[PDB]
Amino acid sequence: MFKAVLFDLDGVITDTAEYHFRAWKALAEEIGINGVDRQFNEQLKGVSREDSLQKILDLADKKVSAEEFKELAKRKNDNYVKMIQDVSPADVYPGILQLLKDLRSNKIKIALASASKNGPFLLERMNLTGYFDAIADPAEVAASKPAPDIFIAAAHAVGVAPSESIGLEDSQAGIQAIKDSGALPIGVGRPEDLGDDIVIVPDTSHYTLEFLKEVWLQKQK
């Protein structure tokens, strides 16, 4: 039986993506840049905050000093941090609360493996801190998501090897990160984005202790 479950936050535990989208959109509008719609934002995923801001500036061929550049980047983050102040327990994805309860009562380790610099704050706002045994700190991770580093740090933080874990993800890079760490991935989304070689649930309400166990069993080969 697996000894720990490693959680990504966005797309699994809750949604932050919409908040990032709105923040960028507020910055753009603040400096009169138009075109940052739910279409363009799709090109801002898995990209750096610097690269994203640049893409946005390239929309209006807007030039700015390296100074004004860093300040714009900071503004986007401040908007984001302001926007997440209202995150609450109601924002927890379906099935997640019960899964955490079930894992805890089954003595299965729980760890956050997220790039979010606001992970601890967000879990406290959703009232989930007490379920987590460890939070892998994004700033201590040398290589981002595609790399297995963070799932490896998250597993070690709870005293297990990744090979004794299951990783829950909503992104292709995340799925790859889990595979390369040696943990068993179970994605949420659709094969077209995630891949055809892993178990996938359409929505998180299907992430139950019973389902995880059956998947872990049917893995033994």
CA–CA separation, 40 vs 158, rounded Å?
39
Q: Of the candidates 167, 188, 193, which has an alpha carbon nearest to the alpha carbon of residue 46? A: 193
Binding segment (CB under 5 A) for Mg ion, from list 3-11, 58-66, 73-81, 181-189 = 3-11
Number of alpha carbons in the 13 Å side-chain half-sphere of residue 218: 10
Ramachandran angles phi, psi of 110, nearest 5° = -125, 125
Q: Is 117 annotated as a binding residue?
A: yes
Name which of 28 and 110 has its Cβ closer to Mg ion: 110
Min separation Cβ 66 and Mg ion, Å: 31
Residue nearest to Mg ion (CB): 11
Q: Contact between 133 and Mg ion (CB under 5 A)?
A: no
* Sequential DSSP letters for 107-130: T-EEEE----TTHHHHHHHTT-GG
Min separation Cβ 32 and Mg ion, Å: 32
User: Is 20 in contact with 26 (CB distance < 8 Å)?
Assistant: no
Q: Is 180 annotated as a binding residue?
A: no
How many residues sit in the footprint of Mg ion (CB under 5 A)? 5
Name which of 11 and 167 has its Cβ closer to Mg ion: 11
Residues 8-37 that bind Mg ion (CB under 5 A): 8, 10-11
Residues in Cβ contact with 150 at an 8 Å cutoff, skipping those fewer than 6 apart: 113, 114, 115, 136, 138, 141, 144, 177
Determine how many CB atoms are found less than 10 A away from the CB of residue 200: 20
Binding segment (CB under 5 A) for Mg ion, from list 5-13, 82-90, 91-99, 184-192 = 5-13
Strands (E), the chain: 4-7, 109-112, 134-135, 165-169, 184-188, 199-201
Binding segment (CB under 5 A) for Mg ion, from list 22-30, 87-95, 144-152, 164-172 = 164-172
Residues 165-204 that bind Mg ion (CB under 5 A): 170-171
Min separation Cβ 64 and Mg ion, Å: 30
Q: Of the candidates 109, 93, 90, 84, which has an alpha carbon nearest to the alpha carbon of residue 167? A: 109
Residues that bind Mg ion (CB under 5 A): 8, 10-11, 170-171
Q: Binding site membership for beta-D-glucose 6-phosphate: which residues?
A: 10, 46-47, 49, 116-118
Q: Binding site membership: which residues?
A: 8, 10, 46-47, 49, 116-118, 170
